[PDB]
Write a protein that binds this ligand. Structure first.
Ligand SMILES: Nc1ncc(/C=C/C(=O)O)cn1
Length: 274
């Protein structure tokens, strides 16, 4: 029935992933994010148990909709003549890593260590559920200013996790791995490590390292900011040209720089002064 259930608010954001609004659950007054998607702009649809032709983004979300707050949760969805309305939980207050970074420029390695770690745990959850985000970046990461927790959002570019090879891609280009930029071929797991490599750099440097294909294809990494001798390692390791030479989510978390990580609360209580 909608409407009588949710009280739509202002336009949070939009873009190629759709349009999101700041609505409230009339039921218990729970802050939620309403997302809209045109059936014409849907890259690839999915399938539900009860045999219902619904968007893939919905299929992916439901597969990761758990108590784990590492990823955005899908409260409920609806179908319309030429579009779908996804109801997602909405943190309050909250700010995406993109604006956060633009606001406070580069981030202290300590703070990064915390975020990046939470991200890994999140991504691991997705893969652990046969789900590949395929579009990991600062814009798709929210920050629960209070609990200092992070969440992954927008799965419109993701797809079912498979050990084979992906020939298609609809995520952000600057974050895409070199193997794709050239041969338009890549493997989820290995590719994910590359995007994370870019992200990690984006945090410690305040911006992405590569801007053009030529830069990506090459793979040479330069640090404009002061980064620990070890952090640079982990970063370059992920950004390894040859996928096979890239670190695994395990090796990444076992990396020296990924030690003595702060807790969600401590982090917010120190860097988010709450
Ligand atoms: N505040 C907030 N909360 C949730 C979202 C979800 C976006 C998305 O699922 O694409 C976006 N913004």
């Amino acid at each position: 029935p909608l409407e009588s259930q949710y009280q739509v608010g202002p336009l949070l954001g939009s873009g190629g992933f759709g349009s999101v609004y700041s609505g409230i659950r009339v039921s218990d007054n729970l802050p939620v994010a309403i997302k809209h998607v045109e059936k014409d702009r849907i890259s690839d649809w999915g399938e539900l148990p009860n045999g219902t032709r619904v968007p893939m983004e919905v299929v992916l979300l439901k597969k990761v909709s758990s108590g784990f707050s590492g990823v955005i949760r899908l409260l409920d969805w609806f179908e319309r003549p030429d579009s779908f309305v996804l109801i997602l939980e909405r943190p309050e207050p909250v700010q995406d890593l993109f604006d956060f970074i633009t606001e406070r420029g580069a981030l202290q390695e300590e703070l990064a260590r915390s975020f990046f770690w939470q991200v890994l745990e999140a991504v691991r959850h997705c893969h652990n559920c046969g789900v590949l985000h395929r579009d990991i970046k600062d814009e798709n990461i929210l920050i629960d200013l209070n609990r200092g927790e992070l969440k992954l959002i927008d799965f419109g570019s993701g797809a079912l996790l498979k050990d084979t090879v992906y020939t298609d891609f609809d995520g952000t280009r600057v974050y895409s791995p070199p193997e794709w930029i050239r041969y338009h071929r890549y493997h989820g797991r290995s590719a994910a490590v590359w995007s994370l490599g870019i992200l990690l750099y984006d945090m410690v440097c305040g911006d992405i390292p590569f801007e053009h294909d030529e830069e990506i294809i090459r793979g040479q990494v330069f640090f404009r900011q002061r980064v620990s001798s070890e952090c640079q390692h982990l970063i370059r390791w992920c950004l390894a040209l040859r996928p096979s030479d890239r670190p695994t989510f395990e090796e990444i978390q076992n990396h020296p720089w990924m030690q003595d990580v702060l807790l969600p609360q401590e982090t917010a209580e120190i860097h988010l002064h709450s």
